[PDB]
Amino acid sequence: FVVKDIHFEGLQRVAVGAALLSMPVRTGDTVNDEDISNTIRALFATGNFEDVRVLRDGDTLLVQVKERPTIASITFSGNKSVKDDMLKQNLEASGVRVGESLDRTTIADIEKGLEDFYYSVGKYSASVKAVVTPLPRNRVDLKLVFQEGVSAEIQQINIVGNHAFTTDELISHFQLRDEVPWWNVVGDRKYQKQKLAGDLETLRSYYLDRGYARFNIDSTQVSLTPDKKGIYVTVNITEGDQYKLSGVEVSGNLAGHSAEIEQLTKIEPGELYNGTKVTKMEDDIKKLLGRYGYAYPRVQSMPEINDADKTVKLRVNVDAGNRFYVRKIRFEGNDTSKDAVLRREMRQMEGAWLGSDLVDQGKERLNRLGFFETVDTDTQRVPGSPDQVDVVYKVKERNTGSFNFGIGYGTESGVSFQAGVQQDNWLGTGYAVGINGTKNDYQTYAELSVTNPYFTVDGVSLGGRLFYNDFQADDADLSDYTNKSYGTDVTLGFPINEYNSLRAGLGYVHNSLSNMQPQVAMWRYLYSMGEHPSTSDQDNSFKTDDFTFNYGWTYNKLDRGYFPTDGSRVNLTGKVTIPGSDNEYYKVTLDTATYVPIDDDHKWVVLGRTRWGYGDGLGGKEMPFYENFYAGGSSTVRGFQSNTIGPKAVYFPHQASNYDPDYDYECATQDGAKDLCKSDDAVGGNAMAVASLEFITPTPFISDKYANSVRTSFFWDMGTVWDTNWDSSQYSGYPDYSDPSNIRMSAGIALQWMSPLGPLVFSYAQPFKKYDGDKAEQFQFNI
């Protein structure tokens, strides 16, 4: 037989000639019946032809084909929290995907491959059925029933052969404490075989430090409890005996640092063997040789375990590299900010021997940078010299955009709103933009704030802040305390060290007031102003163009730009007045941020946030009441309304405010509340002492897609604001705050939420100790 025409009955990925070429008998080649069967298998060797029926019209071949190709979709059903793409990936481990050859044989290969995966999920009561659903002209949907019944659970690890400790104290020193003996309380358990893999060396490292160099885990028998749930394990171990580290005999290339390498391995001979200390002491040598330039130091300890006295003998084999490994360095991930911004954030320079932590401190400086999401590098050895490593600092930059909002219910009332947005160095410009402002009837506030933090080479933080508060506090007119405040604030930072950086600035505080509030602490500073404005009336205006000089300095040794976990930061900032001011005063403050990790996983770190402030006149004046300090609200003592903690002024017995809202906006005025009302809100202390005691807390029930910058954060908030300029005959039958014995107290949790608009903090705090004129807002809403 010799074929004159091959009949092609449906191929759909293999071409007409490409099928024909896979036929060992081509059109014109002679047909053998063995070639026909060879046409069957070799078109079965197409990997796309489900069935191949090679016949012939005498010789003229009739190759009737069924087709495997494109699986046009794959459907999952019963695809529970074990994700269907992972169920697709064991299906991809079955060689199956969308747009693929469907051999309809690998159905159970998907299934039993997933059922074996379902075993290694953590379940065993979990099955799966794959369903073929045909789509146009060869195509198929792969529907997939997943019959997942229930999961397995680790119940109790029976560690037999334990002759040094007890099993339960190991389980305590794997994870556990007690459960209500009128003492501490613990949690729950589930199965995974890698937790089994982890605790067995937590078993061994519990042996490796207490002696026990011939501790060995002999065997392990997981109980197949016949339920597919009960995971008990019968583990055979053997402590061998206690062992001692009885001597260090370090040898090899100690690179001329032999005493130092011996000093890291200064041990007690006969001390119970701590193999965990030994490998540490190897790493002590490695960073020693690393900081000595030897980027690749071999250090090989060897405990010659002397069972005859139940000791070990530490041979160490050390071998360092060469010094000048940091030949040059590279910088990647600087597509948005330049190299020299990231390049100046380093302590490791090229043309040097390796300081092993100079790479790391600069990476910690890059961790202290804040224009990042990741800090990484590629410290790659350029081959060709033992003085040759490229450190390719590849990092991921900032996630930008942040918003803050307040509402005055505009366009359903008077057009009233609070704005505010932060650009977080938009596009890595080295221009951090955060701009806010608000327009109500009460105020029409304007503000500007941006800086190039490095605008000149010495770290010129080119920050000019602007403000124009067209603030009136309008009830109907300029009757209750207008203040049109306007001007600028240009401030500059300069690094005095690598973790110490100074600050200095100037303020132009031009205020335009009218009909000020008919009260003591308002007029008392204005009595210190050289004015004597009307006690019983809001008819009193004020124009101050204050020329003020600002200053400060910061400490910065604390980890991360957007989720730190360890270290300390001090942030000095204050102000003072100069000639040309319309008032002579100072105002000094400081902020601190010190992180003490109780958990060494740093899921629980002490975060102490406290605020201090003091200010008075420079002689013959006061610090203004509008610069007197406050607390409450979103402050370090939250659970309050805003401006609750502080001194409480007294309205003079007042008449119309040049317009009194009738039995509204009460200032001891003519309509209501008259005859020496007391200003119940915190009008301000010229001194301040407040604190907030926060903690890192992990979120063990939250999808950690975003928890890298999400910090649930408990607190116990407490403090005072008090005026050292406070009167006490003016405030005789009124709140006196001349002393900081006004220690408020609240407690609760802060909920920092990483949005694409930045971290969003929210609080609930119940104030359980308060002082005069405090107000309480437990449902505390912050940004």
């Binding site: 400790f165 007890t166 339960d168 065997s219 197949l224 409890t225």
Partner: protein, 371 residues
């Protein structure tokens, strides 16, 4: 509301509540917290009408086989160890031979409690827990452990004769692979899916025969750990592989007479020429001894988590882990009686002993049944 937070699997519990020979109790005397949540081979035994029963919480009784009153009582709650406390926790069943209640523990001890008081007349350790009830013969206590070790402990005073590893399972699985003495040879299964007869008197391999699959690269039973423990009625070793796959094979060579490598067999007894066997459907089926020729089967038992089919009061008796005792017709699979005497599910087999039907569930410890 609160119901909507959980997830389930399926069984079909108690078809055919039957009382045609209406079952009652012979007595009920519950030992304590018995067979437990471990892979357990502890089961009640009834000897001398002095019911040497034990739990896993230490307590070993001798109840009396009329009312279950304590003829003696002890506790294997040892007061020290590497769990800081050592109860009974028995990886072997109750073997009473002589003045010795031999029980193998998950404390790795095979005791031998003196049947007059229950005091440990000897105890000797085995390699970890046992896959096996103590099999006491030839001066030996035959234990096949979870480490696969056919061990031989001196049944009179306690002394290891030969600890011989034969068939440890593929992934250290569990299931009974108890060393049965047949033709002088210890015949062991193995939850590697195999079976082997081995000269018991030193632990010398007569043959080893892989029958069929175990867990590991061919994922099989953890709903019911299949006893590969061979019931060797005569020189055809009758056994199962660990995937349930039944076999009948030579005792001196392991040459297969016939084998069901189709076996979903959970429990299995050779009832004459009719091998009565609990499948994974928890159906009882009478295959032949010269084939898998179904002489009869059962549909009245279906998804029950059964025990082994035993005989008592003229009916095929089988309890289940739903705690329902059943009295099957010894022929074609029909109930005659059915009994819930359990406060539990009967994990252990109905011990049709002393003219009674002794049982002990995990917390439904010792009841005893007549009809």
């Amino acid at each position: 509301l609160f119901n909507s937070e959980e997830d389930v699997v399926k069984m079909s519990p108690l078809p055919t509540v039957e009382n045609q020979f209406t079952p009652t109790t012979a007595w009920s005397t519950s030992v304590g917290s018995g067979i437990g949540n471990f892979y357990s081979n502890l089961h009640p035994a009834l000897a001398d009408n002095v019911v040497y029963a034990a739990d896993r919480a230490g307590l070993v009784k001798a109840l009396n086989a009329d009312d279950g009153k304590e003829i003696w009582s002890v506790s294997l709650a040892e007061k020290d160890g590497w769990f800081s406390k050592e109860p009974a926790l028995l990886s072997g069943g109750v073997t009473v031979s002589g003045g010795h209640v031999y029980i193998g523990s998950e404390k790795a001890q095979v005791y031998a409690l003196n049947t007059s008081d229950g005091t440990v007349a000897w105890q000797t350790k085995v390699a970890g827990e046992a896959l096996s009830r103590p099999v006491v013969s030839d001066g030996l206590v035959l234990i096949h452990t979870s480490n696969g070790q056919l061990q031989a402990l001196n049944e009179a005073d306690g002394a290891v004769k030969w600890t011989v590893n034969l068939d440890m399972p593929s992934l250290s699985l569990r299931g009974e692979s108890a060393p049965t003495t047949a033709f002088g040879a210890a015949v062991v299964g193995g939850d590697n899916g195999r079976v082997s007869a081995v000269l018991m008197e030193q632990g010398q391999m007569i043959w080893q025969q892989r029958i069929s699959q175990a867990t590991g690269s061919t994922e099989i039973d953890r709903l019911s750990d299949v006893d590969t423990t061979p019931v060797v009625v005569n020189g055809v070793v009758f056994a199962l592989a660990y995937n349930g796959n039944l076999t009948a094979l030579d005792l001196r060579s392991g040459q297969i007479m016939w084998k069901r490598e189709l076996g979903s067999v959970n429990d299995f007894i050779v009832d004459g020429n009719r091998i009565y066997l609990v499948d994974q459907n928890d159906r009882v089926m009478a295959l032949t001894i010269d084939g898998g020729v179904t002489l009869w089967t059962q549909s009245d038992l279906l998804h029950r988590l059964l025990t082994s089919p035993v005989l008592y009061n003229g009916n095929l008796v089988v309890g289940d882990s739903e705690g329902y005792l059943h009295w099957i017709n010894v022929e074609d699979g029909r109930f005659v009686a059915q009994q819930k005497v359990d406060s539990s599910g009967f994990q252990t087999e109905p011990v049709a002993a002393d003219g009674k039907l002794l049982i002990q569930a995990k917390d439904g410890t010792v009841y005893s049944i007549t009809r």
